[PDB]
Design a protein around this ligand. Structure first.
Ligand SMILES: *[C@@H]1O[C@H](CO)[C@@H](O)[C@H](O)[C@H]1NC(C)=O
Ligand SMILES: *[C@@H]1O[C@H](CO)[C@@H](O)[C@H](O)[C@H]1NC(C)=O
Ligand SMILES: *[C@@H]1O[C@H](CO)[C@@H](O)[C@H](O)[C@H]1NC(C)=O
Ligand SMILES: *[C@@H]1O[C@H](CO)[C@@H](O)[C@H](O)[C@H]1NC(C)=O
Ligand SMILES: *[C@@H]1O[C@H](CO)[C@@H](O)[C@H](O)[C@H]1NC(C)=O
Ligand SMILES: *[C@@H]1O[C@H](CO)[C@@H](O)[C@H](O)[C@H]1NC(C)=O
Ligand SMILES: *[C@@H]1O[C@H](CO)[C@@H](O)[C@H](O)[C@H]1NC(C)=O
Ligand SMILES: *[C@@H]1O[C@H](CO)[C@@H](O)[C@H](O)[C@H]1NC(C)=O
Lengths: 293, 127
């Protein structure tokens, strides 16, 4: 029960016969998972957490880097990956579902492995992740610093399917989402108008919504999604909303989070991304590593 | 991830030249960009140069185009910045950086927010 750092290992449901790339990297370097769920619930116990300084994020990063590197020296469908604590250490799991990833958490649990997380490299929006339970969440190291990213957890899933390109979003689901987000931002930012506008500039992956499907890279136009005013009340001003994807040479998935950036009478937020570690921070906000005392 | 260490900084007379080097620990995979940044006294950090790890395509800040050259040696996991015709406005701490871009569409390197960072090497250009 002492906070520390140590090398972790991965658990896979990998099958040796499958030639899918996530399998072949996992078969070699991920040990078989444990059927026993394991659990150790605690309560009225407080531990400080900081999702923005967690070495667990860096460890998944270097694995996926090596995964992609050795994979692309065709199949490509990720596997949910479990990251597990070694002997002498454990993983603390904060349980306040209203937790924002920083400060004290009064409800913890003890696990030796993580929940299944498949690695999905993307920008602007987080896909196939873990939905936030109950309320929608807002996470940043410093909201005062415009440069620091803002991760928004989705408590209601929106299905997204793009085929060989265009993308499909139900307007009813999306307009629900933005109204809440701006309302949460209205709590975090006073009196200020709160607009959503597309990426001002940068690389193609950041300016579009980029993702990989079955091995082919898709970059989708986001000017249609980020186009609203959402002040007192709500209002979206764009043309089911459809986005334009560029193939470079279908996927049934659901969005689970947002990535935003603020410019510094109105406060405007734009889609972002790039550091795939923040994609990993979306699924690792709960876990911390401690040394058994 | 990649651990970076810069070298080569120091004092140089106006008009002189200096070559900076940066080597990582840890293998650099095919989708990385490597770049150089600098921070002058009391000023914000700015882009200097970048190079694509696999393709070798370069980009230079307008302030340094012609005067600096970025190069690489993949076998050594090293990147270099040859600085010629140095001027007092180049006095700064120079940082080497890496940016993993697995979803890049082209080989052209970025000039935006790099995510992995070295400790810096100081370059002082005397008037
Ligand atoms: C602590 O977490 C457990 C597990 O979710 C929950 O059952 C319990 O009600 C929580 N205690 C609180 C919120 O006081
Ligand atoms: C999602 O969070 C918002 C917070 O404003 C809440 O109003 C809404 O009911 C939640 N949806 C759920 C729990 O399905
Ligand atoms: C998170 O909650 C803590 C209180 O526990 C607060 O101090 C901090 O400002 C909050 N940060 C965000 C990004 O919500
Ligand atoms: C956030 O604002 C500035 C960064 O722009 C920093 O100096 C300040 O200390 C930060 N405050 C908090 C509470 O994070
Ligand atoms: C998205 O499409 C709009 C309209 O065609 C265009 O103005 C904008 O530049 C496009 N952005 C990208 C990143 O393709
Ligand atoms: C809502 O309208 C009032 C005036 O009726 C104004 O003073 C206030 O700033 C507005 N709030 C927002 C969040 O737009
Ligand atoms: C909002 O959408 C309309 C139509 O899709 C477009 O003409 C307009 O430029 C968008 N606003 C932006 C990109 O700021
Ligand atoms: C999301 O999961 C589905 C099946 O669960 C898969 O077919 C799809 O490729 C996944 N999407 C991404 C972006 O990994």
């Amino acid at each position: 029960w002492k906070e520390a750092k140590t090398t972790l290992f991965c658990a896979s449901d990998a099958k040796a016969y499958e030639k899918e790339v996530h399998n072949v990297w996992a078969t070699h370097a991920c040990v078989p998972t444990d059927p026993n769920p394991q659990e150790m619930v605690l309560a009225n116990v407080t531990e400080n957490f900081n999702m923005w300084k967690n070495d667990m994020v860096e460890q998944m990063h270097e694995d996926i880097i090596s995964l992609w590197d050795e994979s692309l020296k065709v199949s490509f469908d990720p596997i949910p990956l479990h990251y597990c604590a070694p002997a002498g250490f454990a993983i603390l799991k904060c349980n306040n579902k209203t937790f924002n990833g920083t400060g004290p958490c009064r409800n913890v649990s003890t696990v030796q492995c993580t929940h299944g997380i498949k690695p999905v490299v993307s920008t602007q929006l987080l896909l196939n992740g873990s939905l936030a339970e109950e309320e929608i969440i807002i996470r940043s190291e410093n909201l005062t610093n415009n440069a620091k990213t803002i991760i928004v957890h989705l408590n209601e899933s929106v299905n997204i399917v793009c085929t060989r390109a265009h993308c499909n979003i139900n307007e009813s689901k999306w307009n629900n989402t933005l109204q809440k987000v701006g309302e949460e931002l209205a709590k975090h930012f006073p009196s200020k108008t709160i607009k959503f506008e597309p990426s001002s500039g940068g690389d193609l992956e950041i300016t579009t919504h980029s993702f990989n499907c079955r091995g082919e890279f898709f970059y989708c136009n986001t000017s249609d999604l980020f186009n609203g005013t959402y002040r007192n009340g709500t209002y979206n001003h764009t043309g089911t909303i459809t986005l334009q994807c560029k193939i470079k040479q279908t996927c049934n998935s659901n969005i689970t989070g947002l990535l935003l950036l603020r410019d510094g009478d109105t406060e405007t937020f734009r889609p972002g991304g790039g550091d795939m570690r923040d994609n990993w921070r979306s699924e690792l906000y709960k876990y911390k590593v401690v040394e058994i005392k | 991830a990649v651990q970076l260490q810069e070298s080569g900084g120091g004092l140089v007379q106006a008009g002189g030249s200096l070559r900076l080097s940066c080597t990582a620990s840890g293998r650099i995979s095919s989708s990385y960009d490597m770049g150089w940044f600098r921070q002058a006294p009391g000023k914000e950090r700015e882009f200097v140069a970048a190079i694509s790890w696999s393709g070798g395509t370069t980009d230079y800040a307008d302030s340094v185009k012609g005067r600096f050259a970025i190069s690489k040696d993949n076998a050594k996991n090293a990147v270099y910045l040859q600085m010629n015709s140095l001027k007092p406005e180049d006095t700064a701490v120079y940082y080497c950086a890496a940016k993993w871009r697995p979803l890049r569409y082209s080989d052209y390197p970025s000039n935006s927010d790099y995510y992995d960072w070295g400790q810096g090497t100081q370059v002082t250009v005397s008037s």
